[PDB]
RNA sequence: GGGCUUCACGGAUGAAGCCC
RNA sequence: GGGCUUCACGGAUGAAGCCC
């Protein structure tokens, strides 16, 4: 795993076409921004496992 | 972009081979954990352009 | 503008509630 | 466990400083 400590308002990248922005804190929550083309998928842990239903 | 608001300790998934956990928050910063195979790249925005120089 | 919480298979720098 | 800040091309559940 590649752990990083990104400042709010900045971003991270993956592959050559993906970006993972950090919009900021939300208390015990955090608002992240996953940016990828529709060529790939993006879901949360409590919803990916909800598909097998 | 697909914005979401996760809690600390939860996670996100991408490309069916990548997992993006939220390890926690640190004031103006956040700690994320990019889990991807070494078959693909992952770099921060402030150093993706550092490679180009 | 700030703090906390909740909703959201949602592709949008998402949404709603409480307090100052 | 909680609050603030700084250093990290680093694939590691990264690092350092101040306070309870």
By the 10 Å C-beta count (0-12 exposed, 13-18 middle, 19+ buried), A33 is classed as middle
| Rounded distance in angstroms from the CA atom of residue A53 to the C1' atom of nucleotide D15 | 42
Q: What determination technique applies here?
A: NMR
- Flag whether residue B51 sits within 8 Å of chain A, measured between CB atoms: no
Between chain A and chain B, the number of residue pairs with CB atoms below 8 A apart is 136
Sign of CA dihedral B5, B9, B15, B18: positive
Query: Are A14 and B1 an interchain contact pair (Cβ–Cβ within 8 Å)?
Result: no
Domain range list for chain B: 1-53
Are β-strands A11-14 and B42-44 bridged in parallel, bridged antiparallel, or unpaired? antiparallel
- Flag whether residue A43 sits within 8 Å of chain B, measured between CB atoms: yes
Rounded distance, CA B12 to CA A10, Å?
Answer: 18
Rounded distance, CA B32 to CA A49, Å?
Answer: 21
Query: What residue has token string 């919009």?
Result: A23
Beta strands in B1-53 (DSSP E): 2-7, 11-14, 18-26, 29-35, 42-44
Identify whether the C-beta of residue B32 lies closer than 8 Å to the C-beta of residue B24.
Answer: no
- Flag whether residue A17 sits within 8 Å of chain B, measured between CB atoms: no
Query: What residue has token string 């208390």?
Result: A27
The two three-digit tokens of residue B15, written as one number: 């490309």
Does the C-beta of A5 come within 7 A of strand D? yes
Phi-psi region of B14 (alpha: psi -120 to 50; beta: other; left: phi over 0): beta
Q: What are phi and psi of A39, to 5 degrees?
A: -70, -15
């Amino acid at each position: 795993m590649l752990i990083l400590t990104r400042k709010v308002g900045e971003s991270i990248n993956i592959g050559d076409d993906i970006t993972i922005t950090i919009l900021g804190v939300s208390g015990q929550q955090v608002r992240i921004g996953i940016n990828a083309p529709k060529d790939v998928a993006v879901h949360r842990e409590e919803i990916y496992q909800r598909i097998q239903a």
